[PDB]
Amino acid sequence: SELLVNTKSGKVMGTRVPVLSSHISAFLGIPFAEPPVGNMRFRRPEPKKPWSGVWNASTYPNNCQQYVDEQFPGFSGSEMWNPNREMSEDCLYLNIWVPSPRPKSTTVMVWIYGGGFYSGSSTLDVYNGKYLAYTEEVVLVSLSYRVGAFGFLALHGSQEAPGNVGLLDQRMALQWVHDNIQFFGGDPKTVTIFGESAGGASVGMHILSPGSRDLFRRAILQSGSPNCPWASVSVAEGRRRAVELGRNLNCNLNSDEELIHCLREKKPQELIDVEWNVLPFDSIFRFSFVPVIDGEFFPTSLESMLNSGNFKKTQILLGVNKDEGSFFLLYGAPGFSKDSESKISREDFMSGVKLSVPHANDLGLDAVTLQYTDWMDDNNGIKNRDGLDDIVGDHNVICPLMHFVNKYTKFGNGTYLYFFNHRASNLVWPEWMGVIHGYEIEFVFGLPLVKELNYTAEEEALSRRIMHYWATFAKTGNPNESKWPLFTTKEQKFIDLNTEPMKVHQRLRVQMCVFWNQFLPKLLNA
């Protein structure tokens, strides 16, 4: 009855939420896995036992345990991304927003959140699925996953804590979406998984993992690709950070068993507290517990994989933001501050660059500097500012995504690539951060639509246009109902995404990425 749905798991009773003009249906916090609490910490997810009775789904699920950003207490620019519902280890839920009246077989969109893998919430205001569900008559689902130690501790030979437990969770949510969205109006043969930052890299990892390939039709990856430097660790490395976390908690490090026992008994927050003390370097845009390349979730090396077309060949829509580095500078590099134009001194610049390319030796920092320095204005603090933003950005987001697109289009069935370069008229962050990494998500979810959030009409415009590109691609495999060119290894077309009449451009940051993708690596191996 509109709101009471029978799924193979059991009966679920939704809620009717208001949206712009109309009203819609929302099913909140539906279990999809069993609570990964108790002895189940670090363990791969188990599917949720079927329930009897009606599952009430009118209130959002708890957020998974995670790092809460206290840096700008009260600042929405920073709070907008923190858990907004009680954190709990019992957090694997999913949310569905259904058009009303309920469709019969309509495109499904599965949002997968970012947070560098140590944070994320499917309940944040900017991820509110209703303007999209309503505007585009699409079934929107937003899954949850275990982030941090909890979701990514990798003690490789063990069943108690192998890697990618949080990716497996992503997958279980996908399986359930697979198995019951038909009961909601969703066409299971046309679910597009979309995501940002670790959300986007995870999407890319499901396109790559044989286990996930079959559970989704196509993908959208925004500001992330699975080959990002900060998106996966070798199992060795994962082992290392695992025991090291072990140390910070004065655990018995004799056996994995011993180790896992300990961690298994620490209160959640105790893991959260020492989580940043195991990284091997002083670096910006490096996360501690992230997907491990184990040989199960990933058969081989992501490079060998991309290289051999050993991946789902579907059609993907992807892109980047103009100022991807900013956030990471702001919080990690000396010289940048929220309340000043953060003009950086070469002293600061040089420390900055060391932070960004943590693995680069001296000759390596030398090459980075050569490439990103003005030479006729080498102490111009704005320039030093901006070029560091370009480093963190190209290095961590633009170049790996351009490498992923380039390999992938050799065997995919269509590629659409954009470049988002629109600064919300209401951004609360310093203009110097520019088009901030994560600032497209609001367009994608059509916030510029709610008149009380203060956007401009031309942004309401764009949000509408963005949402339609995203839904039309989702259901059709092409963003086009003017023409958004297809990425082609030949010509390499892409479009800027902003409030002006669309321009098609070519070879996104080619000069720069030949440096990161080809020159640097070669240099770094003698």
Added chain:
Amino acid sequence: SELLVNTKSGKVMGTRVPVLSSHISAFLGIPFAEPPVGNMRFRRPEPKKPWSGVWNASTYPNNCQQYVDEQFPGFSGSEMWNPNREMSEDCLYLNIWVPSPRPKSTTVMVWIYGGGFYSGSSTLDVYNGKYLAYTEEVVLVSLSYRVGAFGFLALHGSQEAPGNVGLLDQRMALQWVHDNIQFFGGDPKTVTIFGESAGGASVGMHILSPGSRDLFRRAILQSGSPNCPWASVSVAEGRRRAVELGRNLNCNLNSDEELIHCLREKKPQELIDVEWNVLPFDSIFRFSFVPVIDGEFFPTSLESMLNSGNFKKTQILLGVNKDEGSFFLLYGAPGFSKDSESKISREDFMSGVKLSVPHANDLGLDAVTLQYTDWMDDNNGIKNRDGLDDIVGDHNVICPLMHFVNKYTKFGNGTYLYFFNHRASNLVWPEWMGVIHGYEIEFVFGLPLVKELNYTAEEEALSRRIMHYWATFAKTGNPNESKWPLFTTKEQKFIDLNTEPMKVHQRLRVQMCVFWNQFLPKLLNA
């Protein structure tokens, strides 16, 4: 009497040559040193014994012995640079073109010719001093110097063949100009030495050598700087090529004495014939016998010198051509030919680049390639063509001159820098060579003025404007009688020199030269 001049050497009787409208005086082939023939081969020059009688100076001197370019037999584009008077070891003469009526104290210009140090003639048609002498009322002198083995064999510890014998000759001509141009109408306190390619590097070497500093007021260096890679060899290296030449002639290599004896007895042409067989590599823009850094002509390392302001601080006017590489590609790299658009294959490109950076190891060729390749069009033959032209050019001419300007302006008394990018409407070379290295000289000498050579009115325009910039600077230290900015380490202004209303630009090839001048070198030393 107009044409009979008494110089401290003796009486000289000139000739009256026609020029545009008027007529002028020309004193041709005045001895300034004793014939470096016989046992005097390779030996530093001796000043010319004073003569009695009137030295007849109405016919051009012989050209020094040198390599004659047979590549395009009959082609003027190539013949225009070959000896046009009989070659002879007795070749150290000087030519003077005096306004008429004879001035009383007027600016003197001393042209010093290029030819990569193995060739050159002061008698070539394009070096004909009369349009300049006449247009600008300037005393123009064109000296001669020993090129090749003859002028540059460096057996370091010996008096029979130390290096830079051909530079010492440059200097002797300078001394005489110093001592007698007053007798011609020349103001000895204002002689500007100008030169191109090795002509320009030699100029730069007189600014650097304590011995020469005092003999000239200011300088013009066009397409050359003494720090060019092909402009000087270590004495070790000079030694090496010296004996090696020794071998090709089946000489007794036991002692320098032994060695020098041999060479001293070979007919000139025998040296010319094996001259190219001693270079240590397969390379484009590398000459065999060139100035040696001996510790006499050059106290220390040119770098230590530039570095410490250990040089004449006067005001210099310098610049480059747009297509400096072409000539060297055409003749040295596989794929380029006079009669085809020489589109190059990566196969050819890669051999090309190995030729250009002969000292670069593999990682070095890798860095060069990274920098000069399109990456989105890496087999576009035009692009491969053009980028190789950019390599040979930046590497061998633009970057060293930009390093020289930059160090020098730290202690000079004015710098003027241009960028010549005008393709003579009548060039006989393939359009793909562009603005060829040596193609400004005709503007500088006002050929575009003679109506029978077929230039355009706008080139007559430019030649006039070029000649005036050159003479006004010569006599005044500033090219300006609109404003041609002064090169300043700060802003780095320069002007394009072509038939259009002058544009001031900044930082000539900065991106590229940070590569050659700073990045490459660092890489090449582990």
